[PDB]
């Protein structure tokens, strides 16, 4: 992988399960308090988020963003999103950015 920055305020564990028609992308975040954690996820060449939860999903044209809903902003917030496109990989990459802080 290319040069990746290191997190310095929070934790994040992502999981993924692809079934062809779509792919799952869990994102468990761990914070020591109430921080606005926005997870940006670039989608594959023609991929788009279809199902997500525990976080507000956004769409940056080919990507998507996840933020703490009304109860997922405390010191821990786990959310997930499912993209739809080609079979195998449907998300360019998943980066974590809390109100500007990359984690």
Walk me through the structure:
The chain is mainly β and 103 residues long. It has one domain: Immunoglobulin-like, CATH 2.60.40.290. The protein is 0% helix and 50% strand. A five-stranded antiparallel β-sheet has the order 5-6-3-8-9, with no helix packed on it. A hairpin with a 5-residue loop joins strand 5 and strand 6. The protein is globular and about 40 Å long. This is Chitinase. It comes from Pyrococcus furiosus (strain ATCC 43587 / DSM 3638 / JCM 8422 / Vc1). It is classed as hydrolase.
Number of contiguous helices:
0
Structural class call reads mainly beta
The CATH level-2 architecture is identified as: Sandwich
Strand order of the largest sheet: 5-6-3-8-9
- CATH-defined topology: Immunoglobulin-like
Gyration radius over CA: 13 Å
Oligomerization category of the chains in this entry:
monomer
**What is the terminal-to-terminal distance?**
16 Å
Write down the CATH class: Mainly Beta
| Strand content bin | over 45%
Q: What is the overall silhouette?
A: globular
Number of domains: 1
Question: What share of the residues lie within helices?
Answer: under 10%
> What pattern of helices and strands is seen along the backbone?
EEEEEEEEE
The number of distinct β-strands equals: 9
